Design a protein around this ligand. Structure first.
Ligand SMILES: Nc1ccn([C@@H]2O[C@H](COP(=O)(O)O)[C@@H](O)[C@@H]2O)c(=O)n1
Ligand SMILES: Nc1ccn([C@@H]2O[C@H](COP(=O)(O)O)[C@@H](O)[C@@H]2O)c(=O)n1
Ligand SMILES: Nc1ccn([C@@H]2O[C@H](COP(=O)(O)O)[C@@H](O)[C@@H]2O)c(=O)n1
Ligand SMILES: CC(C)=CCC/C(C)=C/COP(=O)(O)OP(=O)(O)O
Ligand SMILES: [Zn+2]
Ligand SMILES: [Zn+2]
Lengths: 157, 151, 157
């Protein structure tokens, strides 16, 4: 059988650039405020993968009280999430990630996001979709206040 | 063969307390349950049976005073009647406050019982918008849900 | 052997109605500001179907640098996206679309939308779901600034 997972993440702008989206450093006037590297795309993708194994979420797997992964970048977190999913029997069906930002432009950076995700999951490029949209200057993303990301995943049990 | 559905719901605060989320009454310091409403829409969507509003209109007096678990169970009855069984569900609550985490285990249990499925087929999480937008400003709460049905 | 996709689209209100959603014209005091016809629903659906095929999004298929499909309505883009998807060996599992709008009223027009989608996708009506929700007067949709739409898709490989 197959299993569905969903992830959703939001960070507000603040501090100095650059931002890091899908493992890719992107120059911007502002950074993204977060407890770690603020990678909304990898954070949402990890939640979607973990969800499709009902492992709760990032917060459950890497809690307050566990020093092991404190200060770890999102790719480190993604890989360890994967390792722990792959060992529960699951293999990868496919993923689709949707970044929601008015700015910066994401389009030129998406190719390398896809490469980094494929590497971290040990899968073909063909199993990884990443796209970006604006909200036409509407809402807290449209006004340039933060970045949101939605992600969905299908795993084979 | 499997089938995908999606749900999204929003509840505005009007006296802001208490609220009911995932069948759990939470002190904030229809019945407005965004989690179950979005989960129901997702299951009904996977079954191409429309949404909550299509099955139980506000105009129809027959479900006046029905809570979200009752609509969830009735929705699931009609889905099973069409030959579907559960794969799994993933629910994501979007709220600046109140704190959902202590109540999530209970929500999960309520959903598993209502759908007659294993706990491991039910995933519920909560997250914030970091003080951004209507949820971030404390105006209301939202929920995104997805579901996979079988055959 | 199934594959998942997700799509998300937002257009703002501007100038004059009617609006067009799911291929159906709906009377409203405002129209939708868009490069194309502004069909949020068909645009989200297309992105979801393409995402499942790892073919990115409509922008990747139909840039504004490209003359071929310039000025095409959304139904034509969907049928073309669908042609390219089917060329990779994919067939339709099922689709589910969620329109997020305070107004106008969508429900009376939804059966026709489903008819139009099933025809464009060459599938049974049983494989197409379309729902609509308000945001209880909250956010940019609730205040009537615009309309959003989300969609999910399963393809079979
Ligand atoms: N933050 C963003 C948003 C959109 N884009 C690009 O803009 C194109 C059209 O976006 P939109 O539908 O919001 O007008 C997308 O295909 C592509 O992702 C981008 O590069 N960075
Ligand atoms: N734009 C909209 C929004 C909702 N509706 C209708 O209202 C019902 C309930 O929506 P809500 O719970 O957000 O008030 C929907 O099931 C149905 O689609 C509509 O017809 N047009
Ligand atoms: N309204 C909320 C939001 C988050 N939480 C909890 O906070 C943790 C992290 O949330 P966030 O990503 O917004 O910082 C979640 O794992 C958990 O659900 C909560 O209890 N109530
Ligand atoms: C799944 C979700 C949340 C999708 C929509 C993302 C988005 C652009 C939210 C905007 O917030 P807002 O409309 O509340 O901004 P504000 O009320 O400040 O206009
Ligand atoms: Zn994050
Ligand atoms: Zn569009």
């Amino acid at each position: 059988e197959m299993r569905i997972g969903h992830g959703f993440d939001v960070h507000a702008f603040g501090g100095e650039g650059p931002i890091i989206i899908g493992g890719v450093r992107i120059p911007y006037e502002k950074g993204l405020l977060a407890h770690s590297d603020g990678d909304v795309a990898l954070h949402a993708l990890t939640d979607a993968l973990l969800g499709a194994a009902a492992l709760g979420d990032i917060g459950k797997l890497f809690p307050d009280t566990d020093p092991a992964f404190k200060g770890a970048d999102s790719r480190e977190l993604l890989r360890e999430a994967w390792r722990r999913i792959q060992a529960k029997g699951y293999t990868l069906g496919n993923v689709d990630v949707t970044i929601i930002a008015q700015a910066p432009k994401m389009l030129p950076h998406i190719p390398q996001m896809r490469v980094f995700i494929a590497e971290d999951l040990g899968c073909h490029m063909d199993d990884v979709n990443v796209k970006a949209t604006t909200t036409e200057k509407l809402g807290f993303t449209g006004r340039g206040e933060g970045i949101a990301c939605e992600a969905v995943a299908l795993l084979i049990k």
